[PDB]
Design a protein around this ligand. Sequence first.
Ligand code: NA
Ligand code: NA
Ligand code: NA
Ligand code: NA
Ligand code: NA
Ligand code: NA
Ligand code: NA
Ligand code: NA
Lengths: 29, 29, 29, 29
Amino acid sequence: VKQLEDVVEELLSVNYHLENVVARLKKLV
Amino acid sequence: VKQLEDVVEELLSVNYHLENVVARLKKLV
Amino acid sequence: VKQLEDVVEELLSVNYHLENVVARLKKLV
Amino acid sequence: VKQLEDVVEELLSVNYHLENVVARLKKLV
Ligand code: NA
Ligand code: NA
Ligand code: NA
Ligand code: NA
Ligand code: NA
Ligand code: NA
Ligand code: NA
Ligand code: NA
């Protein structure tokens, strides 16, 4: 688990970070 | 543009799809 | 596990699919 | 454009970062 919950942490951040870049793209475009 | 807005469409879907898989992972884990 | 390996499957596909949309964006842009 | 190529930069990094977290998950799991 302890390794798994650290992957989950990094996935949460990657996912938030993609959603902010996609919102920025969508108003650029 | 017309090519750009189709990339934006696919990014929106990829991003939603990642958020649902991450929510599922986070309650599995 | 069986639930975990199905999340892993979906993540693999989401990740491939993002890499193809990013390659397409990068040559559009 | 200059705004677009900065989105592209951030997408490249998000995509690399997801692929490393997915590779780590897949060998955890
Ligand atoms: Na932590
Ligand atoms: Na940003
Ligand atoms: Na459409
Ligand atoms: Na799903
Ligand atoms: Na399968
Ligand atoms: Na595509
Ligand atoms: Na730069
Ligand atoms: Na990492």
